[PDB]
Design a protein around this motif. Structure first.
Motif, PDB file in Angstrom:
ATOM      1  N   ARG A  67      -2.143  -6.609  11.656  1.00  0.00           N
ATOM      2  CA  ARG A  67      -2.029  -6.650  10.202  1.00  0.00           C
ATOM      3  C   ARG A  67      -0.563  -6.668   9.787  1.00  0.00           C
ATOM      4  NH1 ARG A  67      -6.036  -1.900   8.129  1.00  0.00           N
ATOM      5  NH2 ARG A  67      -5.177  -0.804   9.948  1.00  0.00           N
ATOM      6  N   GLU A 103       0.773  -1.236   0.000  1.00  0.00           N
ATOM      7  CA  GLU A 103       0.000   0.000   0.000  1.00  0.00           C
ATOM      8  C   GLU A 103       0.807   1.291   0.000  1.00  0.00           C
ATOM      9  OE1 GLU A 103      -2.562   0.131   3.340  1.00  0.00           O
ATOM     10  OE2 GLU A 103      -4.254  -0.837   2.351  1.00  0.00           O
ATOM     11  N   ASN A 104       1.979   1.312   0.640  1.00  0.00           N
ATOM     12  CA  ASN A 104       3.053   2.237   0.291  1.00  0.00           C
ATOM     13  C   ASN A 104       4.403   1.689   0.733  1.00  0.00           C
ATOM     14  OD1 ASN A 104       2.563   2.618   3.006  1.00  0.00           O
ATOM     15  ND2 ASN A 104       2.180   4.828   2.878  1.00  0.00           N
ATOM     16  N   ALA A 160       2.795   8.014   7.592  1.00  0.00           N
ATOM     17  CA  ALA A 160       2.255   6.928   8.405  1.00  0.00           C
ATOM     18  C   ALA A 160       1.453   5.982   7.526  1.00  0.00           C
ATOM     19  CB  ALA A 160       1.383   7.487   9.525  1.00  0.00           C
ATOM     20  N   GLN A 161       1.646   4.679   7.719  1.00  0.00           N
ATOM     21  CA  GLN A 161       0.830   3.718   6.995  1.00  0.00           C
ATOM     22  C   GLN A 161      -0.291   3.169   7.870  1.00  0.00           C
ATOM     23  OE1 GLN A 161       2.751   0.293   5.413  1.00  0.00           O
ATOM     24  NE2 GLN A 161       0.884  -0.384   4.374  1.00  0.00           N
ATOM     25  N   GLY A 162      -1.517   3.456   7.465  1.00  0.00           N
ATOM     26  CA  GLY A 162      -2.658   3.031   8.240  1.00  0.00           C
ATOM     27  C   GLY A 162      -3.363   4.201   8.894  1.00  0.00           C
ATOM     28  N   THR A 163      -4.584   3.955   9.323  1.00  0.00           N
ATOM     29  CA  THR A 163      -5.355   4.908  10.101  1.00  0.00           C
ATOM     30  C   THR A 163      -5.418   4.358  11.510  1.00  0.00           C
ATOM     31  OG1 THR A 163      -7.424   3.801   9.622  1.00  0.00           O
ATOM     32  CG2 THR A 163      -6.696   5.496   8.108  1.00  0.00           C
TER      33      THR A 163
END
Lengths: 386, 62, 224, 136
Positions: free
Chosen positions: C57, C8-9, D5-8
RNA sequence: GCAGUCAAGCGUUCAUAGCGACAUUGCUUUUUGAUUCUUCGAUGUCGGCUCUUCCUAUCAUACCGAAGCAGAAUUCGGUAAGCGUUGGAUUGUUCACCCACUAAUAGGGAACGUGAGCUGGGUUUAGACCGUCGUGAGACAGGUUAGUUUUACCCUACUGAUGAAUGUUACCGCAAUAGUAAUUGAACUUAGUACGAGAGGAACAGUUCAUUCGGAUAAUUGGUUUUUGCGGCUGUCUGAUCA
């Protein structure tokens, strides 16, 4: 001088004046927009609020982190005896508002709506609706004249219903009388349905259903006369203040030489009409249906009434709506649930929810046991009976 | 849905109830209420606290 | 084939994927291009299983396994364990691990023959690992790093280690593991080498920013 | 959350305002940290910008190696000790505050992180998940 | 302080994309002057705190127009105040300066808003110290230190709270009118795509969240705890035990 640190307001000017409500029963200001297609059904309903309990369900939301995974939530259980219809009332749309042209009451009112009309039931001769109930000695030609006048006229038709407070574990004995608009087509069909349902039950399995968004209109829990700080959320002043710290320091400017309405003052807090929209039903429970509090995963027979009963209410032995999240109004209040006014497509709504576990330990302490059979299994035998 | 037993009292902890505590050596502790927690912060030995399960197993009660 | 893939990144796929010889474990939170690199070159060879571990995750760094086994932590729910038991074949040995000294992804760096674990983890865990994986468990730290699953990638053919590593310990691990090791980096010089990439006998998925001099050395030492 | 940042991150409780002195929890040689501001915070008059588990603080170092002192660096919290609510119900908290020094991108300064790490952060910063020991 | 017009020039080439000399016409009343019209039988005088409202000459956000707009970023302009405009080090500071976050850290008014709202750090009483000047008493918009801030019970305003009378009394209602509220960002995805020689590198729809605001609630979690409810502990007094 300007403010020097341009910060938001405190409070909300649209919720003004903050005064006591008109009654303990909050007016439904706005009913759902009618469509003349659907079968005749009501728009709202009258319950009594019991209290809250914990729910474990399965959150099902793609794109989230908790997809297909258990969450807890709080629900309020609002108690619902079946509500019985006593009359109908038609409104002719004028250029000054929907003026009521007539009302028709049913034949044999019960002793609760007969009790609504007296401040003093014990001394009174109980003579309300005697001379009106004499209009059934004929075939009802006066009464059929009235209903034909509604069918000839009367753009919107509201139905006088009342709760059955005698089934509710309160101590009131006096029912609350209210109006609910109908949604069926062809107003003749509405008032024919209301004529067919005089002195008849209306249960919530008919109006409401599973998963549906409802609104809730109720009167706020009241808290008396409250100063400017906890009422409006205003800052306290620093400790070194003379003559009261917990205040609003500057009221207004020198000019306008009067105190503006928008500044915060001290006064009533609580007991206001509040409408709260988009609450979601998780259970519609039936009192004759044993084991309200079981679910497909739970499978042990118990009702939703907690051990020791709801605190300050009693025991649910009736139908009940069980709705997500907090609701306005405290326990033992007449709470008006309403159908949602807009079709919501929001993916928080339109979620097929089904519970997994309903909390039924005591709300009167740190409850440790769900059922008294499980307390007897865990704790063993005592000094008492054996 | 799991029903996790307590660390101090032996009580059963239903979901959305109680607290969890993580001691710095990564041993995980579970508390039913504020009672067993606020006795755990006093470093009380559960074998001498009369109403826990660990006590009533210590002396063969019942 | 060293295929460039991003979660996703992220230039680290080894956080989010677990690549074995008979199965492959992926996290659910990615687009179809993330699973394109898996389903294009694997296709119909090994089952690729959508799962989460213990409500996380990061499932490549929570679990550890080989061709013969899979080890999950204690906080994994029964639904996730039942889905892993249903989707994986009967040859794998799936078992919860009763320890609180780490997650299993950063303790264990194992393969079909020889395991390498954290030094502080205990004998009651090591017996279970050697029973389930059928692998003789050894205890080594690469160049002072106590996390060897984060700082060493292992395959049956070869293996990658931490870039700042003494030659003597690499030769000791070559005498012990009986595979050749080469100190290199991944993803434009990121010092973490275990989580930057995964590997098995047929495939070695890395991040997109892993350079061509890194990629050539990787595809040479793992011999794909 | 914030830039890089990856994710919430689902909102948890704010238990480390500006001024808080957390215990740096790795082998980077810093013995503690010191929050000066919080990435992603908000503007409200006379309110301190507070941080939480998973957030990314601007921190300095007040102990340890003098090469790390007197320079403002990024850091990321891994233990909280003010109890928050996970959505699966339980309220948990750690024994003490913590944090790890990192660059703006989220790449770790040190090598290994000691003690437990909240999985609210290990999911959110992947590099911290790589260098973590115990999660949850 | 802000704004125009004119237009020589600057801008590879080109007055006007953006700038603009030499001149010339205004707006403003947050500077400061000029005046001294009211108040000296005294409108309490700096700043911070606090809180509301208004103004746009708009910093951000909504929709757009020009470009020396390829994309990104930026500049100039239009409609618009609806909504927001921060945490700290030093200074009594207004002013300023940095550190740092942010979508952004725009500028102002309201007797230089606001002391029977606070504070009293400053200035501006009486004590004291120094430097300078004066023969001296003393003098310094020179520096330092310690220095009482009174009253609301009236009328108005505002906030809530009742209430006579309209045949009585009760119940369900309608609606004039007055107010109104939501806010902004980030991540994935679109997508390493379009546009690009390359370097770089978006947006619209969708999803999940988050900041600020607001209204409610009390299941769970935390606080309070005179249920003095239960336990314990001290000192003394009830002859001791019990209480």
């Amino acid at each position: 001088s300007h403010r020097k640190y341009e910060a938001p307001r405190h409070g909300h000017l649209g919720f003004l004046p903050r005064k006591r409500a008109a009654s303990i029963r909050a007016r439904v200001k706005a009913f759902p927009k009618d469509d003349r297609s659907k079968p005749v059904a009501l728009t709202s309903f009258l319950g009594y609020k019991a209290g809250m309990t914990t729910i474990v369900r399965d959150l099902d939301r793609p794109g989230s982190k908790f997809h297909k995974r258990e969450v807890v939530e709080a629900v309020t259980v609002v108690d619902t005896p079946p509500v019985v219809v006593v009359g109908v009332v038609g409104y002719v749309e004028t250029p000054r508002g929907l003026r009521s042209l007539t009302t028709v009451w049913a034949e044999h009112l019960s002793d609760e709506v007969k009790r609504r009309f007296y401040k003093n039931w014990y001394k009174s001769k109980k003579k309300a609706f005697t001379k009106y109930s004499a209009k059934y000695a004929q075939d009802g030609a006066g009464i059929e004249r009235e209903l034909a006048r509604i069918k000839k006229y009367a753009s919107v038709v509201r139905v006088l219903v009342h709760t059955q407070i005698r089934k509710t574990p309160l101590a009131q004995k006096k029912a609350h009388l209210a109006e609910i608009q109908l949604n069926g087509g062809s107003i003749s069909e509405k008032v024919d349905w209301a004529r067919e349902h005089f002195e008849k039950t209306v249960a919530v399995d008919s109006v409401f259903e599973q998963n549906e968004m409802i609104d809730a209109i109720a009167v706020t829990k009241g808290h008396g006369f409250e100063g400017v700080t906890h009422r409006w959320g205003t800052k306290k002043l620093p400790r070194k203040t003379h003559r009261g710290l917990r205040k609003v320091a500057c009221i207004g400017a020198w000019h306008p030489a009067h105190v503006m309405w928008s500044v915060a003052r001290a006064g009533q807090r609580g007991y206001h009409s509040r409408t709260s929209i988009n609450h979601k039903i998780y259970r519609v429970g039936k009192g004759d249906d044993e084991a309200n509090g079981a679910t497909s995963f739970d499978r042990t027979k118990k009702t939703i009434t907690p051990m020791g009963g709801f605190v300050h209410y009693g025991e649910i032995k009736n139908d009940f709506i069980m709705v997500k999240g907090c609701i306005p109004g405290n326990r033992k209040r007449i709470v008006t649930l309403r159908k949602s006014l807009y079709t919501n497509t929001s993916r928080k709504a339109l979620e097929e929810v089904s519970l997994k576990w309903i909390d039924t330990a005591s709300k009167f302490g740190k409850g440790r046991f769900q059922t008294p059979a499980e307390k007897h299994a865990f704790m063993g035998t005592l000094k008492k009976d054996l | 849905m799991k029903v996790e037993i307590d660390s101090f009292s032996g009580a059963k902890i239903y979901p959305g109830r109680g607290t969890l505590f993580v001691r710095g050596d990564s041993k995980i502790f579970r508390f039913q209420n504020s009672k067993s927690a606020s006795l755990f912060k006093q470093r009380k030995n559960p074998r001498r606290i009369a109403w826990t399960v660990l006590f009533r197993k210590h002396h063969k009660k019942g | 084939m060293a295929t460039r893939t991003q979660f996703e990144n992220s230039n680290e796929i080894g956080v989010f994927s677990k690549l074995t010889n008979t199965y492959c474990l992926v996290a659910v939170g990615g687009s179809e291009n993330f699973y394109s690199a898996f389903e294009a070159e694997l296709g119909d060879a090994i089952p690729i299983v959508h799962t989460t571990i213990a409500g996380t995750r990061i499932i490549g760094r929570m679990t550890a396994g080989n061709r013969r086994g899979l080890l999950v932590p204690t906080q994994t729910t029964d639904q996730e364990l039942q889905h892993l038991r249903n989707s994986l074949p009967d040859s794998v040995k799936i078992q919860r691990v009763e320890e609180r000294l780490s997650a299993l992804g950063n303790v264990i760096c194992c393969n079909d023959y020889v395991a390498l674990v954290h030094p502080d983890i205990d004998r009651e865990t090591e017996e279970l690992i050697s029973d389930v994986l059928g692998v003789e468990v050894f205890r080594q730290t690469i160049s002072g790093n106590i996390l060897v699953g984060s700082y060493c990638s292992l395959s049956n053919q070869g293996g990658l280690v931490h870039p700042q590593t003494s030659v003597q310990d690499q030769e000791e691990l070559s005498s012990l593991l009986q595979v050749p090791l080469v100190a290199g980096t991944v993803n434009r010089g990121s010092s973490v080498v275990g989580a930057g990439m995964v590997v098995n006998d047929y495939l070695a998925v890395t991040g997109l920013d892993t350079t061509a001099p890194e990629l050539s050395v990787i595809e040479s030492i793992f011999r794909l | 959350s914030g830039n890089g940042a990856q994710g919430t991150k689902f909102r948890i409780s704010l238990g480390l305002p500006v001024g808080a002195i957390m215990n740096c929890a790795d082998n980077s040689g810093a013995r503690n940290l010191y929050i000066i501001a919080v990435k992603g915070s908000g503007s409200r008059l006379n309110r301190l910008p507070a941080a939480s588990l998973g957030d990314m603080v601007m921190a300095t170092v007040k102990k340890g190696k003098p090469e790390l002192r007197k320079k403002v660096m990024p850091a990321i919290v891994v233990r909280q000790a003010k109890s928050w609510r996970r959505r699966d119900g339980v309220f948990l908290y750690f024994e003490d505050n913590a944090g790890v020094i990192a660059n703006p991108k989220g790449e770790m300064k040190g090598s290994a992180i000691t003690g437990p790490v909240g999985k609210e952060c290990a999911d959110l910063w992947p590099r911290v998940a790589s260098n973590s020991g115990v999660v949850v």
